[PDB]
């Protein structure tokens, strides 16, 4: 359940609560948001936060 | 009863201990005060208002 | 642990490095003496013998 | 004659030397003494916990190391680059004699120009200043080009300007007189025509085979130096008549029709060269240092003598062929192009001689200029780090590691060897001491020293149990059973592994004595 | 001379050797073959031999030499 | 004790393997377990 | 504050006073800070980091002697050391460190037989930790001897 | 106030004459002058910190206070490292003022307000190009 | 110590047994501590005295503007000492005496010179000790840290090791009674902040204001406000910095008979730093100055500083900044002597 608050809110999903398992979606999302990241429009994450 | 190095404070940049040293004196300063106080044993009022 | 009067001042450099002076004052009263208690144990097996 | 022969310079003697004004003393240094597997007494001298000059025995080796390792720690764990360098030379142009003393040139030839100025065409020139008992008192750097004012002898009194140039200009300097002629100098062919008006200024560009058409590929544009009659006229004292290739970006002021003097300048030529010399410091510095990696992109130097020309264009590297006078010419050096010249075309350079701006790997130090040159840097530079922080150490101990690293030589000629193999220089001068003493040569042979970082020439020890002790050891034990590799152990630390007695300091009588038993009756 | 050894490297200049020198002379002394050729201040052979060596009565050409004389003696 | 020197390294050639050995250990076992002689 | 409070006690309000030595009875100049201060005393009790070892038990495989507390121990000459005492000429020194010390067992039993009889002298012999890497290597299909001239 | 970078040099801010021309003698001289003060300063203050490494560095015995005397050094190589970082600009700076080619935006052509030269002396760009390219800098580098 | 890197701290040492002859011998001879009090690394003394001991001397040798026994004339130093100890004159008061000073003058000969110097009691009672062939100049000045090694020095240098040892002894016990017997120690109010903190403080935060106030107007990015303002903070530093020294420094305005004068200052932080025992002005700023810019983990500098000190009191933030900077530094101390040791072993295994 932390997992996947973690999960949706980092791609800006108003869902907390999921299916544990991938949905290809899921996969797909990151990707889109891969890119954008790559493109500029967001900030790259520190493993250093609290 | 015990004697400390003075060198050992301005290069190690702990000064709190010599407040700490200060106030303490201060406070043995009150408590032989009242120590003073009940050895002639004056009397309540006075202890008290001390 | 306890509460000393302290003088900062240097003794015939006995504190010449972060090493303290005491006086017999302390020793004498006993406060700075601890307990320990420690276990010792002795077990009795069998041998071949 | 006040200080004999090869004396121990104590105290008192070094007093004596100052009390006069020598300047300059030829001292015998570990890295250049003559005795195989181990050094002099003499060459190292006295330096240690006691007074005296250095006894028979004592193992210098680990002493320097151990000197050298346990300071360390005052520096800071990074790479400061505070790259100030603080006191420069107040500006880049005029020159500012410190302490009224004689002038002194060292390295240039100069030339006489019309209002009788010393000119000088020289790159290696230096500029020192003698004082009153015959000393270096101020010592300047002058770059290629700067016109002077006092020459050499006059006496400068305090603080006046002896020298002036521009900094970013490289002149081109004409040596003699006549008029100019204009070779392969076609408009629209080779140049590119910006002209003002009738004070004659232009910003000719001398373009390079990208910018100049398909025809102007080849072209060298030229300026000859011709007289009224029509033979070229020859550089002063030399043969050579002077044909200035004009680089790119030569603004041609003088143009063609303008006789002019012998000294006056030809063309100005921009060049921003960077003037600061960032200091560098720290620990690793220090540990890439005593490893010998090669630098960043490195300086360039000379090979051989003679004059220098070009060679194929533009490829993707310049070409530059030194063609020795005397020696075979065919030394062509292919050149990246974002490395900046120093020296013309039609110029004599000598070998060693810089020709690029940058850091110099100790590797070519040795090759070119020999031991004592790259020793010296090596001292020096670590030296510098080590007195930022303001840790003393004294040079014999640098200098010691740096024997050590050049204990290797590999040969070229022929006559006993395999003609290419990696040898100890040990083997190597005793076998050629034998055959020189032998009536035959065989051939031969002619070796090159080669300089190691610390770390292979530790791997590149003979002893094997040494090896083993610290290195791979699998590697080690593999090639040496293979090869059937005999240890006399010779060595410290194989003897500590045996343990008998080190051949160090008390125990030195005791190998020494066995070493005449060995091979006796 | 339990202090500085200055002296016996002034006599010896090795300051190596010395101390085998040394040794000699104290096992030769420890091994009853030998009495102390100085006054002792209550010290140990060590000491003594590095008082014997340094005042030059002793050195390494003073053992060999009386060394091979009493191995002549000691012949008879 | 021998006063040696020049230690002298290669590779072991069978019969000199047979030559240093003084038999062959032909089963795993260790101990008896119950008395625990070899 | 502290300076009001330490008026409140009738004390100097720079907290300093001047102190006699105890010994001579002579002031001390510029008076001394003197005062409580809350002091503690650690785990870290001289009473268990002394330690000597002159002999004991050894290990099984390298027959050095063990270290610890439990058993009684003997510190380790590492190479630091050994560079150390190489920096002298320290040549006999060294050697009995290596050899006689710890893993020469004929070598430490003879001179403990010296030491009791008065006299001084050694017999080095072989580490033993050499010898075990002898063997160990001579386990692999290298062939290591000791060879002679 | 004596803590800008006017207040280095005994300069006072310059005032364009009415019917003054942009680049004038006077004004690439002031500028000129300026610049050589400030990089004068601030090698000065190099020599200052190098001496005082120099003196200060020793060996500590406690690993609790090699810190304390190397975690101030830090802070301060930093600052020197920063200033020698502008020591390469301040250079070009006044390659460009001795070219006579300073003062004018090297994107577009405009001209770079006086006020500004005044402010920061070694100003390559207009404020718009500046702000553009270090929104431009800042969102590729994040 | 110095040579040990050793502290008195629970550090440990071990002890351990040279057992036959040649050993004994090869200890006492290269290995005896007084054989090697010479560097390997340079060819100056590693045994100088620490930190008390210079803190003595310099107490001892300091000389005042008015004491007790103002221009006395004493027939000698053992005078000079009775003076002191009974009590007619202070430690430290400037003094005609007479002094025999001896020179190797000739091929090593002592030709004794004898004259009247004008120093202190404490530097007669000091040249008491010094042996026959130094000058009496060596003792004569301050004698501080740097003096005190050069007084070794030359004592090495002329006369020989024998004489350095006894005298470098002598150096240790005379500095550690006469530090005792001066009483030296560090009081809350010994560190006195300058009166123009708050005051440069406040042109700087002006200045900050003008540099808002010109951004506002567009003249300037955030990058350069930034900049700008880290450096105006670097210079307001500095300037606290050296007028608190200022002030500390030269403070004692003692008076003679009539009009007063003013003198290298006894303030005892301010001895404990120019004696060279501990401290430098580094330390001395961050105690009664202002500890400066600090430093965020990524290198870059947080722009506000903290303008408090330790005599003062720290907030929450400028702790939390200073731990950021403390904490990085004493993670890298350990990484940092680690990799030395390795370089130091691979220097060794070479050579
Ligand atoms: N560091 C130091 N040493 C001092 C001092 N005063 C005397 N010594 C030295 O200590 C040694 C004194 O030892 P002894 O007097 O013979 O008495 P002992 O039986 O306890 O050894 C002498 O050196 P020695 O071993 O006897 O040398 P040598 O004269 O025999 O050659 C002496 O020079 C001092 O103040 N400081
Ligand atoms: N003392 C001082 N240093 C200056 C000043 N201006 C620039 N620097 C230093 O020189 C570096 C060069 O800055 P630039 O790349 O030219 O960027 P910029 O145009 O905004 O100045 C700066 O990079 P930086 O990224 O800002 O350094 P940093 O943030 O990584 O520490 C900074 O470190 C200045 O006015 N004063
Ligand atoms: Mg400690
Ligand atoms: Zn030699
Ligand atoms: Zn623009």
Known sequence: AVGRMKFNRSLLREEIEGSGILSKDDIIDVMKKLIDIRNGKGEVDDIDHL | DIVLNPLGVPSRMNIGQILETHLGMAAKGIGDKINAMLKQQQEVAKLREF | GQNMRVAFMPWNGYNFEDSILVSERVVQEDRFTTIHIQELACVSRDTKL | ILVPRNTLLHEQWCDLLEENSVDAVKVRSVVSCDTDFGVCAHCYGRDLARGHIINKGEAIGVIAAQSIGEPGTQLTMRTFHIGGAASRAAAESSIQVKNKGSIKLSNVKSVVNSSGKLVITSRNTELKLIDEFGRTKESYKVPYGAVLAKGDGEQVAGGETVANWDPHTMPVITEVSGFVRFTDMIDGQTITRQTDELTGLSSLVVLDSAERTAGGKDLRPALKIVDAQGNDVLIPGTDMPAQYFLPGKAIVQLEDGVQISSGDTLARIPQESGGTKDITGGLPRVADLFEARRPKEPAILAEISGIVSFGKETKGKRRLVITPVDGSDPYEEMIPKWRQLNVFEGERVERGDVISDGPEAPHDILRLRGVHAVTRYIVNEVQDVYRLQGVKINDKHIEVIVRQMLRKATIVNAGSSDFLEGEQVEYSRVKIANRELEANGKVGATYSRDLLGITKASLATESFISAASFQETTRVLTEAAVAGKRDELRGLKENVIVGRLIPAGTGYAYHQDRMRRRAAG | ARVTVQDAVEKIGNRFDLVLVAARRARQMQVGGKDPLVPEENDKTTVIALREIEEGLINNQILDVRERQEQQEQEA | TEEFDAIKIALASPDMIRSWSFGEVKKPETINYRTFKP | EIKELLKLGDLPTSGQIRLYDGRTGEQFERPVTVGYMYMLKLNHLVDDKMHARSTGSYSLVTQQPLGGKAQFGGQRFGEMEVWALEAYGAAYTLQEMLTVKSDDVNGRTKMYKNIVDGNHQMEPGMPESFNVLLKEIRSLGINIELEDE | ?142 | CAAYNADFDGDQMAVHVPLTLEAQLEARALMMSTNNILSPANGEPIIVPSQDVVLGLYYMTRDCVNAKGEGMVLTGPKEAERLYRSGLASLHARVKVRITEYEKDANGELVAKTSLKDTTVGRAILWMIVPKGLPYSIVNQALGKKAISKMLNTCYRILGLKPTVIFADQIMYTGFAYAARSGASVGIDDMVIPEKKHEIISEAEAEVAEIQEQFQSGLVTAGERYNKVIDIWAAANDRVSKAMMDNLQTETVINRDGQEEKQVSFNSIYMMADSGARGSAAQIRQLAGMRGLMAKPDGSIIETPITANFREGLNVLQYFISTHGARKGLADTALKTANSGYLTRRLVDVA
């Open chain 8, 1 to 142: 106030s004596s803590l800008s970078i006017l207040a280095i040099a005994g300069v006072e801010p310059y005032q364009e004459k009415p019917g003054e021309e942009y680049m004038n003698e006077a004004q690439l001289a002031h500028f000129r002058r300026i610049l050589e003060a400030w990089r004068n300063q601030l090698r000065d203050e190099v020599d200052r910190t190098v001496t005082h490494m120099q003196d200060e560095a020793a060996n500590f015995p406690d690993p609790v206070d090699r810190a304390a005397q190397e975690e101030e050094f830090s802070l301060e190589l930093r600052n020197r490292d920063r200033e020698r970082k502008l020591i390469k600009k301040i250079e070009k700076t006044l390659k460009k003022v001795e070219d006579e080619d300073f003062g004018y935006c090297e994107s577009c052509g405009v001209e770079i307000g006086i006020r500004r030269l005044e402010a920061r002396p070694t100003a390559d760009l207009c404020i718009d190009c500046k702000t553009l390219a270090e929104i431009r800098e800042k969102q590729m580098a994040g």
